[PDB]
Amino acid sequence: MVETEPVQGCRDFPPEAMRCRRHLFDVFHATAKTFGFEEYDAPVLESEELYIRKAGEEITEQMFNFITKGGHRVALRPEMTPSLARLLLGKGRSLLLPAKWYSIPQCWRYERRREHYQWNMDIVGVKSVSAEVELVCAACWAMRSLGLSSKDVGIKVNSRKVLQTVVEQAGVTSDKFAPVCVIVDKMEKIPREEVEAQLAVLGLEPTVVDAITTTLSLKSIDEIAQRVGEEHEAVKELRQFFEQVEAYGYGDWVLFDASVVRGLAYYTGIVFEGFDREGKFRALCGGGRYDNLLTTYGSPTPIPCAGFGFGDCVIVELLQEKRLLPDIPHVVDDVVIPFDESMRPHALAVLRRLRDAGRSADIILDKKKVVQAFNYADRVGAVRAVLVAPEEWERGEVQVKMLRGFAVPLDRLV
Amino acid sequence: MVETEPVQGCRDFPPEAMRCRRHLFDVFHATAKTFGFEEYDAPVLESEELYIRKAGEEITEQMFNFITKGGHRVALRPEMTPSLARLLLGKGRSLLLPAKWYSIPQCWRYERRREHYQWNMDIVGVKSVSAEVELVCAACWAMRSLGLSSKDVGIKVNSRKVLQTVVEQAGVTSDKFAPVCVIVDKMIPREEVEAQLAVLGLEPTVVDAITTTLSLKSIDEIAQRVGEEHEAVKELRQFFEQVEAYGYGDWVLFDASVVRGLAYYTGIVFEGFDREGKFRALCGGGRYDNLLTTYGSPTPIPCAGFGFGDCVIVELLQEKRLLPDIPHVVDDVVIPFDESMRPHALAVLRRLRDAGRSADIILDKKKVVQAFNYADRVGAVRAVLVAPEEWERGEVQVKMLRGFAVPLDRLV
Ligand SMILES: N[C@@H](Cc1c[nH]c[nH+]1)C(=O)O
Ligand SMILES: N[C@@H](Cc1c[nH]c[nH+]1)C(=O)O
Numbered sequence A: 001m002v003e004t005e006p007v008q009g010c011r012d013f014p015p016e017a018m019r020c021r022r023h024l025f026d027v028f029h030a031t032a033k034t035f036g037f038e039e040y041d042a043p044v045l046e047s048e049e050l051y052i053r054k055a056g057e058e059i060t061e062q063m064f065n066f067i068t069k070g071g072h073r074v075a076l077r078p079e080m081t082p083s084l085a086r087l088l089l090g091k092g093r094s095l096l097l098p099a100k101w102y103s104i105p106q107c108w109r110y111e112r113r114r115e116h117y118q119w120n121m122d123i124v125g126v127k128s129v130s131a132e133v134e135l136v137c138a139a140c141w142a143m144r145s146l147g148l149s150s151k152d153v154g155i156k157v158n159s160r161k162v163l164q165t166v167v168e169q170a171g172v173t174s175d176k177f178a179p180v181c182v183i184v185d186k187m188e189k190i191p192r193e194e195v196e197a198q199l200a201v202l203g204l205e206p207t208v209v210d211a212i213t214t215t216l217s218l219k220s221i222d223e224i225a226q227r228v229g230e231e232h233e234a235v236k237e238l239r240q241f242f243e244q245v246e247a248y249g250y251g252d253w254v255l256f257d258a259s260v261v262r263g264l265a266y267y268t269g270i271v272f273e274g275f276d277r278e279g280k281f282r283a284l285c286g287g288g289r290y291d292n293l294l295t296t297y298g299s300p301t302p303i304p305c306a307g308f309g310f311g312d313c314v315i316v317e318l319l320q321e322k323r324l325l326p327d328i329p330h331v332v333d334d335v336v337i338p339f340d341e342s343m344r345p346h347a348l349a350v351l352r353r354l355r356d357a358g359r360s361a362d363i364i365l366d367k368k369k370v371v372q373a374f375n376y377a378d379r380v381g382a383v384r385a386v387l388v389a390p391e392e393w394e395r396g397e398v399q400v401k402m403l404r405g406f407a408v409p410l411d412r413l414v
Numbered sequence B: 001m002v003e004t005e006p007v008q009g010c011r012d013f014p015p016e017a018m019r020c021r022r023h024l025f026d027v028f029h030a031t032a033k034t035f036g037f038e039e040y041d042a043p044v045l046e047s048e049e050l051y052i053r054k055a056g057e058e059i060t061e062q063m064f065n066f067i068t069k070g071g072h073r074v075a076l077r078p079e080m081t082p083s084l085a086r087l088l089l090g091k092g093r094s095l096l097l098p099a100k101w102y103s104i105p106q107c108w109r110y111e112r113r114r115e116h117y118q119w120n121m122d123i124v125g126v127k128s129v130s131a132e133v134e135l136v137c138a139a140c141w142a143m144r145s146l147g148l149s150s151k152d153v154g155i156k157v158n159s160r161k162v163l164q165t166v167v168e169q170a171g172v173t174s175d176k177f178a179p180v181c182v183i184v185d186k187m188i189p190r191e192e193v194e195a196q197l198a199v200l201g202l203e204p205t206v207v208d209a210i211t212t213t214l215s216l217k218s219i220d221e222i223a224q225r226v227g228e229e230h231e232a233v234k235e236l237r238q239f240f241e242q243v244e245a246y247g248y249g250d251w252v253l254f255d256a257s258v259v260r261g262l263a264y265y266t267g268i269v270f271e272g273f274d275r276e277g278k279f280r281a282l283c284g285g286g287r288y289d290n291l292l293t294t295y296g297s298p299t300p301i302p303c304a305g306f307g308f309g310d311c312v313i314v315e316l317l318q319e320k321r322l323l324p325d326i327p328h329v330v331d332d333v334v335i336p337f338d339e340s341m342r343p344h345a346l347a348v349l350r351r352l353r354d355a356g357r358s359a360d361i362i363l364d365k366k367k368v369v370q371a372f373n374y375a376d377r378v379g380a381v382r383a384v385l386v387a388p389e390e391w392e393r394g395e396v397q398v399k400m401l402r403g404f405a406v407p408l409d410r411l412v
């Protein structure tokens, strides 16, 4: 006997599990379409150089990389955003903006799960917070579509610009900002002593660290306004953002949280993450504005961007807890049953007709008695059994039985 | 500037190319559903041990394998069938049979394209040729659905059992049969193939009989050589009788040269081809009744299926002009008259989406005429201008793309 288990930290999807995954992806696709996003894809295998950002980020640290036989430094993508950027740069001026692109890539890591699917939604070429508004509303829409309400989940929202200023006022070179965010993102995962220590090695004195901590604890936008001024870009932008989400009708889903910075180096403005309101699960989704990324890759002109990722594992756990993932059995409209093998040719012609009309239909493939054929029909969740028997056939008819009997002319089947 | 091109032999799918791929996959999915197959998936990364069949097969020879940091021998799958088998074995007796499973995995190779998508359709637990009938009909259905007819394409059909007997009559141990098929599938010059069979260990007389039967042009001529009640004859006849009865007789034909390159096929094999002789095989498959036994199934489990790649079909469809660009479309584009109307425009956008419509809103600041140009560019069916005067009347202004006032409730 061979190894029946999948490779370590990778999931199989037999039909039952695949139906659950399809249920979820159908929502991702349908939400994208509802919101006017266009699908794209790129190779799971990308060049390693694409993820070397040197900011101590977790997803680049835990990158499932290797070397080809020809010596090229490649990686299974740990995220999609750099791929998106590559594609955008490749198009250059031929790309019409604004663009709204989405995908559902499998993404990888190595250290626990080594593999997940991550819905990515990104808006390209929009300077204003309307992009972040749309993105956050998309994420809410998807969760709404899976049966969740604003009682079950929320989206925490912040801007890194508040922190950008505090760092800049202390005198720390702007090069240190991305590392600072990556470290401060660790506040829940490790103790405050551990994070204070990490910022010390980065090269910031205790007074600068104190100001950082203080602003993360600020509980409202007014309290930000007091600290940095009402004219501060972050204040106007966050206000516009909440005003717009409120107007769209998702005010109950969103709130301000000054502790949210995200772990990625490249976010420059508004950032956000989804969470369950019971405090039981890790983040459901996460994203933000990243206006300089394409400039760092060498775009001759700055290109504003914003987007998010929405994983496939935490959401499912939440949905299972809330009892929103009942098994959906397999279904098919018709099961065609030859009375015996001599009727098979006739049964095949019926099967053809049924399928031609857009119905999903099986035919009993092996030899079996009608009662067993009917049992099989019930097992595959057939709505209807179509028995093709000799007496009825000579009258131009079949015998039909609803699952969930009597003669019917062949033309009236469809 | 960073490298904008993808990794060697891998494809990008920006929206235009992705639409084409979606058009194709929608057919694969819709065909599977029409035929009652159930979707499954498995990891692109599988254990290397799963593909070491030692028969000199091309897809195992060209396998994109590597070693993890922890030293485990893994591979990016070159095909799906072994994964399927693993999954089937894992279920064991809890698997209800017959089962009809399908998937659309990306599969890999290393040597030219390193990567393709391959629709897989497999029927499990059906002894009889009805499985192969259904599978072949599924493949025809898919091509029909893409706009192809039996004038454009066909499916060549054969059984390896004919060749199995010829080999067995010559006295060659049954262990040599799979290698023989893998070599004969290469029909490189005849001199090169004759040579390969010689090293496998068959004498010239045994090689001659093989060659002869591959050149036989009809089932009757098979019947003459091996007898009318040889399993292959009865089975092929049943197969054509059933495909004929289903209504796809014009799509299928017999070809004794078709054996396929995979070690594990035991019975009927088939491959799709364009009737102009311009392209490589469109799809390929067959019965493989012993595979699950070789993996250690305590009971033999009959199987049959095929793979249907995503590259050749597209080339064929492009030649036949059956892949026009499908522009992106959206039902509505909501246009704020100016920024002060944005909150109102957002409420309208909400309502439109609530009713199942696809809708954009103009995100950045722009004049109405430019907003309308953008609406046309994204292929909007309708522009909904949200302007102050109309709003005070409980209305918006609507213009069809492909103007006048409308009450807000009548938009949807
Ligand atoms: N790549 C981010 C999500 C994202 C998409 N776009 C912007 N951010 C992540 O993996 O967390
Ligand atoms: N695995 C085969 C196709 C197939 C699927 N099932 C049976 N045959 C191939 O790659 O050519």
Ligand SMILES: COc1cccnc1
Pocket: A059, A078, A079, A107, A108, A109, A113, A114, A115, A116
């Ligand atoms: C970042 O890549 C991941 C994360 C979690 C699971 N699998 C892959």
Ligand SMILES: COc1cccnc1
Pocket: B059, B078, B079, B107, B108, B109, B113, B114, B115, B116
């Ligand atoms: C078998 O793997 C393949 C085949 C063709 C193209 N790309 C990968």
